[PDB]
Design a protein around this nucleic acid. Structure first.
Ligand SMILES: [Zn+2]
Ligand SMILES: [Zn+2]
Ligand SMILES: [Zn+2]
Ligand SMILES: [Zn+2]
Lengths: 78, 80
DNA sequence: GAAGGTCAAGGCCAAG
DNA sequence: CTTGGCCTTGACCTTC
């Protein structure tokens, strides 16, 4: 029915405002929650697709935000 | 007046299966009675069931639903 | 009011 | 270790 706006994999439905896969939803939650920061080993323009999404966390978070993922929709830890 | 859930002390959205409960305890009881679910306590069936510790034990949450007066008979069948 | 249903948010844990 | 699949929960809603 839908595709992930960040990597192109199958989308379950919307998560944090964006149509995304379980992977991308999980990764964005974890980053906002633990307040993580990553470093790009390349030139901050890595290909984020199903096969390459775990090659660069920096650019994956960067795509999450750019595609409209909302940090505020990530509720606090139990 | 304002009411609190008889099972966990969360805000009560009204009476549900005869008992003043919240949307959480209401939901939980429905899915338990409907799917005829059976749980098992990892401790000795005395777990505290409050607003922030209710999903830690499904066995005890269900037990307090019954002990407090929720009616299995009030849980209807799936709208086909 | 009090039944019903929905679906994005949660959590867990096996896969990777 | 982190990733992500799968299932539970409950805020918000409609149906009776
Ligand atoms: Zn994705
Ligand atoms: Zn990169
Ligand atoms: Zn409750
Ligand atoms: Zn218990």
């Amino acid at each position: 029915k839908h595709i992930c706006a960040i990597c192109g994999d199958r989308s379950s439905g919307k998560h944090y405002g964006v149509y995304s896969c379980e992977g991308c939803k999980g990764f964005f939650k974890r980053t906002v929650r633990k307040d993580l920061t990553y470093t790009c080993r390349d030139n901050k323009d890595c290909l984020i697709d199903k096969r390459q999404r775990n090659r660069c966390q920096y650019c994956r978070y960067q795509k999450c935000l750019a595609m409209g993922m909302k940090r505020e929709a990530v509720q606090e830890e139990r």
